[PDB]
Structure 1
């Protein structure tokens, strides 16, 4: 009786009311019920959003470049033809990626178990920065612009990145579903639908056609 819910009239869960950004009381499988699993899942969803947004942005920009005339492959089968004629071998690229990501994902991990553990100044004497402002929102060094030093603006600005990330990760499932059917770029599926709405789904393989 204080916030919009996902199902109008249903009783919101008793383990989440208004503290988390993007809270609508949607949890039917009783997940993140304990404080620790919720502290885990919050930052898990946050990282999912922060990767889905970058992925969808890159995909859409490369697709618009390809449709406009740029030398850009589509989002699918792009790691196959960018590796054939590249100076950096596969494997030597994968383990470079994993070596650079382990060192940062580990520091991201142990700031979840004990916040502020990274701001002791052992890494290049960085003390003020590298200190977890909240569960999954660090600051100081990752926030060069003073755009989170006000709760009135921050509680309202963080409640929209979760929505944009949820929408972006729903769009990423659209990218996959929208490829196994048409085998065309995501921007191509758009222009083939605005120019003629009659070319809507349920026309190629969405529904079974034995008759």
Structure 2
């Protein structure tokens, strides 16, 4: 399996044991959807780890009923136990309307990261290649940095 937007500059078909059968195109398509979704979520999560620190936490409350404030929710893994769980349920609802609105069954465009977002799309198939591989490489670096920040918060006891 080559040409599938996965081989980059400092690396090739990086599989110490990945793609164990070196086939099973259905498994590989599922893994492609998995990796692209993981990368997008990670990029967002690292983004949201480094936004509150470099740009002060939101000015509002985030909970008028529970008297919580944005400036009172700690940044990092501790926020999961501070954000009101109705808020996490609403985040789950947004994830649902973001996952179940458009189908992502195998074969469908949803199974290839094609959720019709565009906005930062391009025009030429080579420019398409550039944008897609940029997104994928940034997502891999994201995943790495996001689990790194997870462990930094877990061990150091704070955001950094």
Structure 1 pair 106/71, CA: closer, same or farther in 2 (3 Å)? closer
1:106 paired to 2:100: yes
Task: Report the number of matched residues.
Answer: 141
Q: Which has the higher helix share?
A: 2
Report what 2:41 is aligned to: 51
Give the number of the structure with larger relative contact order, counting CA–CA contacts within 8 Å between residues 6 or more apart.
Answer: 2
For residues 32 and 54 of structure 2, the distance between their equivalents in structure 1, rounded to whole angstroms, comes to 33
Q: Distance in 1 between matches of 2:124 and 2:144?
A: 31
Name the SS for the 1:137 alignment partner: coil
Is contact 1:53-1:168 (8 Å) kept?
A: yes
**5+ unaligned residues in a row in structure 1: which ranges?**
1-15, 84-89, 116-131, 187-211
Structure 1 residue ranges, 4+ long, deviating more than 6 angstroms after superposition: none
TM-score, normalized by length of structure 2? 0.71
Partner of 1:42: 32
Q: Which residue of 2 aligns with 1:200?
A: none
Query: What's the TM-score once normalised by structure 1's chain length?
Result: 0.56
Q: For 1:135, which of 112, 117, 142 is the aligned residue?
A: 112
Aligned to 2:4: 20
What's the RMSD between the two structures over aligned residues? 2.9
What displacement does 1:170 show? 0.8
For residues 74 and 94 of structure 1, the distance between their equivalents in structure 2, rounded to whole angstroms, comes to 15
Taking the aligned partners of 1:133 and 1:100, their CA distance within structure 2 comes to 17
Larger radius of gyration: 1
Q: CA deviation at 1:164?
A: 0.9
**SS of residue matched to 2:139:** helix
In 1, the alpha carbon distance for the partners of 2:147 and 2:42 equals 10
